[PDB]
Amino acid sequence: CGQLRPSMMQHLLRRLVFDVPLLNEHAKMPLKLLTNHYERCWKYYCLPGGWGNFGAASEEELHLSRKLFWGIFDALSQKKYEQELFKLALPCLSAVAGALPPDYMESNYVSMMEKQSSMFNPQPVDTSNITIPEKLEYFINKYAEHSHDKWSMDKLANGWIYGEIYSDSSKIQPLMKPYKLLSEKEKEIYRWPIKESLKTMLAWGWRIERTREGDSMALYNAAHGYSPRAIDMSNVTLSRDLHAMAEMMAENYHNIWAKKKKLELESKGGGNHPLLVPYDTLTAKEKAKDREKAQDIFKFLQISGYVVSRLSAASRPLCTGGHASNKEKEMVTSLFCKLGVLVRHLGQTLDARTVMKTGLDSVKSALRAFLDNAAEDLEKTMENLKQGQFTHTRSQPKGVTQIINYTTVALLPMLDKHNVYSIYNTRSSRERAALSLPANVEDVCPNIPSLEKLMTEIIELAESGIRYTQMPYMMEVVLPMLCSYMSRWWEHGPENHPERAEMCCTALNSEHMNTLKIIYNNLGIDEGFSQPIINKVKPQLLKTHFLPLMEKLKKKAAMVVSEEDHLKAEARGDMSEAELLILDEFTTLARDLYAFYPLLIRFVDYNRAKWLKEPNPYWSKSHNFKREEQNFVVQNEINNMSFLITDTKSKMSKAAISDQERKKMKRKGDRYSMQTSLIVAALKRLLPIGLNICAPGDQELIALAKNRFSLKDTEEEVRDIIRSNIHLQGKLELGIANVLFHLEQKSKY
C-alpha cells in the first residue's frame, strides 16, 4: 500500500509505449498484477484522466496487455464501496464507439462484461491577442500590498531593516515603502505573474462571482505606520472546481517553464535536463513545491470571494446511463438492420457477436437496474431486442446463443405497456407455425431446418420467453386464445409422439392457467365481445373432466409411463393463481393427488432413477410417507448386509450401484426435506406418532452413514455430475446433500 500516490504504472506505461526492451515485457506484468491489489481505489486521482486522454489519443495499438490490465482492475474493483463513475463514463463510451473497426483475433475481444462499469503540449493556449478587461481597482492593490508586506517581513526575519541608502554590506533595504510610492520595475515584477494568471483564466472563459458577502480582505486577527502581520489562510477547505482550476494553472506554469528551459537549452547549443517529467511521475522534492504553489494559489483566490465556475428529471434529458442505453439500442438496431439487409437477400459477424454480448447484458442484477433506470421506453426496447433476437435465430446460427437468449428472456417476468407498441406479431406467427409440434414435423418450415428450428432449442426457449408467474404483461387478446388452443391440442393427444432427440417436450409452456372437444372456436365465431374464458364454468368443467385422467393414471412401464406422468404434471400444474384460496376443496383435492402420485410412482422398485430429471415439489399422506421410508430403509439395510460379504465384481459395477443409490437418496430426500416442515409442524403440538415413525428412519440413516467408504467416494462424483443444485434449505418454505438443515431439524426432535 502506498502513502499518497504511486509512480509505478506511469513508468510501466512509459516503458511499454516504446519497444526498446526485447522479450522483457514479461517482467513487469506480474509486477502490475501484484501492485494493483496493494493500492486502493482512492489513490486514482490523476491516473484516470491520463488513461482517458491516452485512450482518446489512440484506441487501437500493439499493447494487448492493456485490456487485460483494465479487465483485471475492473473485476477487482467490485467492492462494497461502490465508487461513482465520475470520469469513467467517457473512456468506456469511447472504447464502445471505437471497438467496431477491430476484427476478431485473440480472446482479448470476448470478455466485454467489464464494459460500462457493469451498468506533450508545449503550447496549450495562446494569449498573444488577449486583452485583460479593466475590472480591477482594489483587490489587486490589496493583494500586491499583502505580497509586499510578506516579502518585507521575510527580509526582516533574515536581518534586513528599512533605511535610506542601499548597502549590501550593512544589510540595508530601502524598499520598505508603501506600494503607492514603490518603484515601477518592482511593481511590474510583482504584477507580471498575477497578470499572466488573470490572462490565462480569462482566456478559457468562465463565470466570475462578485458576491458582497465575500469581502474578507481584513477579517483575520515601522516607518509610515508599517506593521506587517502573518495570516494563516491555508486551513480553509476549498471546492473541487477551484482545485481543478489551480491544477490547470500549475500545468500551464510548468509547460511555460519547460518551454523556457527548452529555449535556453537550444540557445546554448547543447545540454539536457531530467526535469521533463509529468505530474504523476514527479517525486516528493518537487511535490512539496507543487503543494506550496497550490496552497499559495488557493490563498490568493480565497480572498474577496472570487470563485471560478463553469435539465428535466428523466433519463433522456440529463442521465448518462439512460443516454448510454438509448445509444446502445441505436447501434444494435442499426447493426441488426445492416445484417438483415446485406446478409439476408469477415469481421462483421465478430462485431455483431461483440455488440450482442455487450448490448444484451450489461449488469448481472438486470432486474433492479431496469426498475431503477426507466419505465416507459424499457418495455419497447426489450420488445425490440426480443424481436431482433427472434429474427436472427430464424436463420442458421453459427455460435451458441442459447444462454444469452435465456438470460434475456428471464427478465420478462421481472407493468409493461403493451398497448402502445404491439411487438407480439412475430411470436404469434411463430406459435401459429408451431401450433402442433408432433404434427408439424415436415418441410413446412423454410429452408428445411433439421436443427435450427425443429429441435429442442425452441422448446427450451419458449419456457423462458413465456413466463408471467409474477404479473401478466401481455395484451390479453391472442395469448389466452393460444393457451386454449395448446390446452385443447394436448387434451386431444394423450401421448407425446415427438420427433428424434425430443423426449423432453414437457418443458414447453410455463403459463398453463385459466384465462391466460373444446368449443372455443364456436364461441369466438359467435362473439366475433366477452371471451368464453371469462366465465368460471369452463375451467371448472375442464378440471372435472380431467380429474379421472390422473385418477386412473398408473402404469408399470419405464419411459412411456414416466413421460406421460411428466406431461400430466405439466398440463395440470399447481400454479392455479386464479383464486387458489377460494377453491379450498379443489386445492385440497389437488394437494392430495400430488401427494399420492409420488407414492404410487415410488411403489415400484425403480432401479433406474434417471427418468425424472427434476420432479415438481395429512395423516394418511404422512403414514404413507413413513411406510415408504421404512420400506426403503429396510431395503437399504438388506443391500448393506448383502454387500458386507460375498464381494462383487470389479469397481465399475459397484460404482454404478453406488451412483444409482445416491441418485435415489437425493430424489427421496428432496421430498423428505419438502415435507419435513409439515411433519415438524404436525408433531410440535400433540402428535408423537410422527416422531415415533421418524425415529427408525433416523436410526437407519445414522447406521448407514456410520461406516461407509464407497458411498463417500461416489458422493463427490455424483455431485460433480449433477451440476444442477436446488438449495431449498434457505428458502424455508447436487440438489441435496447428506447433511443439511433437514437433517438438523430431524435430529433436533
Partner: protein, 623 residues
C-alpha cells in the same frame, strides 16, 4: 401554496374556462332548489348568489374572476403540466357533450354535460385534497386576521370554530359539501377534455417515506458484574414494531451497535448481522417474534433460534459467529430505533418463556436469570450529557503536563498540552478538564488561564463561564441564551422593589467584535483569570480589555471545573496553560404503583420510597 405568478399568455382560454365554469355553478345553484330574491333573507329561501350574469353585481363577478385566477395559478404552479389538449365544446368545436343531458325548470336552463365514464385517476383526488387544504388555509388566515368566532384576549363569542387546524381538527364528515362540490368540479374538468398526472405515485419519487438521522439512540444493557464464563443461557425478545432492532451480546469495556468487534448484534430489518462489516445472515421477523440469542463458551459458537427455527446464512452455516475471544464475558444487549417498542424476557419463570420447550429443554439450555432470587437490573444509554469525564485517551489527544514555573516565569503557570485534532473532526464539542494543581494595592488573585490562539476565528469561538447544570448539547446554540429568566419578587401592590434578575445556563459572552482594530499575533488579553476579593455576584472573566455591559449579577456558589466552548476542524487552537452520551445508566428498580380512577383522575401512592446520594470529598458528589 404560493410559488410563482401565472404568466399573461393563456388569458383567452383562462377567461373562456372561467366564464363557462361560472355559468356551470350558477345553473347548479339555480337547480339546487332555491329561488332568486331581490333582498337577502334565509327565511324566504332566497339567495343572492342565484342571479344571472346579466344582473350580477360587479363585486361578485370580480371576486369570482379573482378566485378562478388564483385556483388556476395554483394548479398551474403545483408542478403538473396543464397545457391545452382537447378544445372545449363551446364556439370552437361541437362534440355533442352539451345536449347530452337536458333539464327543464321555471326559468332559463341550458343543457349541461356530465361525463362520468372516464376512469377516476388519483390525480383528481390529489387535486381535490389540495384545493380543500388551500380553502381551509385561507379560511383560517381570514379568521386569524379578523378574529371572528373565537377569542383569546377578547372572547367576543363562544363556540370556537374547529377550522383553525386544516387537517386534524377538521373531519371529512363536516366538510362533505365542499368535498362533493370539488368532486363535481374535477369531474366536469375531466369531461371538458383535460389530461392530468398524479405526482404522488411510483413513477416519480416526489414523496419521502423516512426522515431522520443517527440521533436518539438508546442501548439497553445489563450489569457488568453479570457476565458469564461458561454454560448456555437463553432469553427471549418479543419484537412488537418492526424496525432497527440490533440484538446480540455485548462485551463490557453514541457509538452504533456492532460498528466494531466489542459487541455482537443481529437484526432482521435488513436481514443481516453486524460484526466489523456487513454480512448477510438470517431472515426478517414479524410482529410478536423472538430472536433467542444463544451462547456456548465451551466451543465458542453463536446461534439464533427464531420462533424455534435456527436461522442460516447464504453459506448454509449454523454458526453465526466463530473464533472469537472469550474476554471478560458477555451480557445481553438490545437496540431500539425511533418509535420502536421492545419486550425483554430474561427467563424469570419457565412459564413466562414461550419458545423454550421447543428448543431449550432438549438441547440442555437454561434461562439467563433462572437462578437469581432478586429482580434483574438493567441499564440504558443516558441521553442527557454530563461533564463528569476527563479525556484520557482520544483520537488526537496527547495531554502531558509540563511544569516550568521555577525561576523562569514567562506566563506564571507555564504548562503545555496538545489538545488539537488532525483532520476531519468537527462536531461542535465542549471541553472540560480537571485541576490537579485582603491584600493592599492588589487587583486580583488566581492568575491562571487556559491558553487559546484567536488568530483564526473559524466560527466565532465563544468564551465565558459555565454553570453546574448544562443539558443543551445541540449544534445550534448562542442564539437565544435559553431564556432570560427574570424574577420580580416584591410586594407588587403599588411599587416593585428588589426585582433581582436571574440567569439560565448561559454565562458565555458572544465576543463577536471587541474592537475594529484587527491586532496581529495571538496574545490580546484572552480570558485573563481574575477573581474579586469580595463576593458580590460579579466575576471578571473576559477576553477583551473594554467593558461592554456584561455584568451578569447572580447568586454565589457557582465555581467549578473550567469549561470553554469552541468549534473548528484542525487548527491546533486549544492548549492548556468532552460531552458523551454512551455511558450506561439505570433509571429505577423499586418504581411505585399508581392507581387512576374515572371522574376525578385521583392518583394514590401509599408506599414511601427513600434513597441516598454520595459523600465523596471536595464536597460535591451526588450520582
Amino acid at each position: 401554496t404560493s410559488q410563482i405568478v401565472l404568466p399573461p399568455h393563456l388569458e383567452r382560454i383562462r377567461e373562456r374556462l372561467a366564464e363557462n365554469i361560472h355559468e356551470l355553478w350558477v345553473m347548479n345553484k339555480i337547480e339546487l332548489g332555491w329561488q332568486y330574491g331581490p333582498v337577502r333573507d334565509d327565511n324566504k329561501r332566497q339567495h343572492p348568489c342565484l342571479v344571472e350574469f346579466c344582473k350580477l353585481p360587479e363585486q361578485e363577478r370580480n371576486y369570482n374572476l379573482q378566485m378562478s385566477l388564483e385556483t388556476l395559478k395554483t394548479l398551474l404552479a403545483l408542478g403538473c403540466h396543464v397545457g391545452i389538449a382537447d378544445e372545449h365544446a363551446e364556439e370552437k368545436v361541437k362534440k355533442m357533450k352539451l345536449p347530452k343531458n337536458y333539464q327543464l325548470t321555471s326559468g332559463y336552463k341550458p343543457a349541461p354535460m356530465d361525463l362520468s365514464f372516464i376512469k377516476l385517476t388519483p390525480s383528481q383526488e390529489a387535486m381535490v385534497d389540495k384545493l380543500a387544504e388551500n380553502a381551509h388555509n385561507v379560511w383560517a388566515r381570514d379568521r386569524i386576521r379578523q378574529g371572528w368566532t373565537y377569542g383569546i384576549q377578547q372572547d367576543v363569542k363562544n363556540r370556537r370554530n374547529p377550522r383553525l387546524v386544516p387537517y386534524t381538527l377538521l373531519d371529512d364528515r363536516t366538510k362533505k359539501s365542499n368535498k362533493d362540490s370539488l368532486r363535481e368540479a374535477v369531474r366536469t374538468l375531466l369531461g371538458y377534455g383535460y389530461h392530468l398526472e398524479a405526482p404522488d405515485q411510483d413513477h416519480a419519487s416526489r414523496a419521502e417515506v423516512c426522515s431522520g438521522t443517527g440521533e436518539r439512540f438508546r442501548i439497553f444493557r445489563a450489569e457488568k458484574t453479570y457476565a458469564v464464563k461458561a454454560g448456555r443461557w437463553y432469553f427471549e425478545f418479543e419484537a412488537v414494531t418492526a424496525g432497527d432492532m440490533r440484538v446480540g451480546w455485548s462485551r463490557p469495556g453514541d457509538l452504533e451497535l456492532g460498528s466494531d468487534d466489542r459487541a455482537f448484534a443481529f437484526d432482521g430489518f435488513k436481514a443481516q448481522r453486524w460484526h466489523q462489516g456487513n454480512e448477510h445472515y438470517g431472515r426478517s421477523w414479524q410482529a410478536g417474534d423472538v430472536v433467542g440469542c444463544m451462547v456456548d463458551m465451551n466451543e465458542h459458537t453463536m446461534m439464533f433460534t427464531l420462533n424455534g427455527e435456527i436461522l442460516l446464512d447464504d453459506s448454509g452455516s449454523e454458526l453465526a459467529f466463530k473464533d472469537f475471544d472469550v474476554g471478560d464475558g458477555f451480557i445481553p444487549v438490545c437496540s431500539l430505533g425511533v418509535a420502536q417498542v421492545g419486550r425483554m424476557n430474561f427467563g424469570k419463570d419457565v412459564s413466562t418463556l414461550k419458545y423454550f420447550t421447543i428448543c431449550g429443554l432438549q438441547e440442555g439450555y437454561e434461562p439467563f436469570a433462572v437462578n437469581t432470587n432478586r429482580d434483574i437490573t438493567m441499564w440504558l444509554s443516558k441521553r442527557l450529557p454530563q461533564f463528569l469525564q476527563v479525556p484520557s485517551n482520544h483520537e488526537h489527544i496527547e495531554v502531558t503536563r509540563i511544569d516550568g514555573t521555577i525561576d523562569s516565569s514567562p506566563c506564571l503557570k507555564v504548562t503545555q498540552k496538545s489538545f488539537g485534532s488532525q483532520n476531519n473532526n468537527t462536531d461542535i464539542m465542549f471541553y472540560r478538564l480537571s485541576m490537579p494543581i485582603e491584600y493592599l494595592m492588589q487587583t486580583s488573585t488566581y492568575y491562571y488561564s487556559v491558553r487559546i490562539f484567536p488568530g483564526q476565528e473559524p466560527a466565532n469561538v465563544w468564551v465565558g463561564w459555565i454553570t453546574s447544570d448544562f443539558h443543551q448539547y445541540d449544534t445550534g446554540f448562542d442564539l437565544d441564551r435559553v431564556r432570560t429568566v427574570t424574577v420580580t419578587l416584591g410586594d407588587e401592590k403599588g411599587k416593585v422593589h428588589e426585582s433581582i434578575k436571574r440567569s439560565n445556563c448561559y454565562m458565555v459572552c458572544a465576543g463577536e467584535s471587541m474592537s475594529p482594530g484587527q491586532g496581529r499575533n495571538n496574545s490580546n488579553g484572552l480570558e485573563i483569570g481574575c477573581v474579586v476579593d469580595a463576593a458580590s455576584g460579579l466575576l471578571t472573566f473576559i477576553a477583551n480589555g473594554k467593558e461592554l455591559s456584561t455584568y451578569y449579577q447572580v447568586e454565589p456558589s457557582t465555581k467549578l471545573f473550567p469549561a470553554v466552548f469552541a468549534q473548528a476542524t484542525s487548527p491546533n487552537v486549544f492548549q492548556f496553560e468532552v460531552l458523551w452520551s454512551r455511558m450506561p445508566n439505570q433509571f429505577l428498580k423499586v418504581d411505585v404503583s399508581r392507581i387512576s380512577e374515572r371522574q376525578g383522575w385521583l392518583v394514590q401512592c401509599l408506599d414511601p420510597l427513600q434513597f441516598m446520594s454520595l459523600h465523596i470529598p471536595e464536597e460535591n458528589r451526588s450520582v
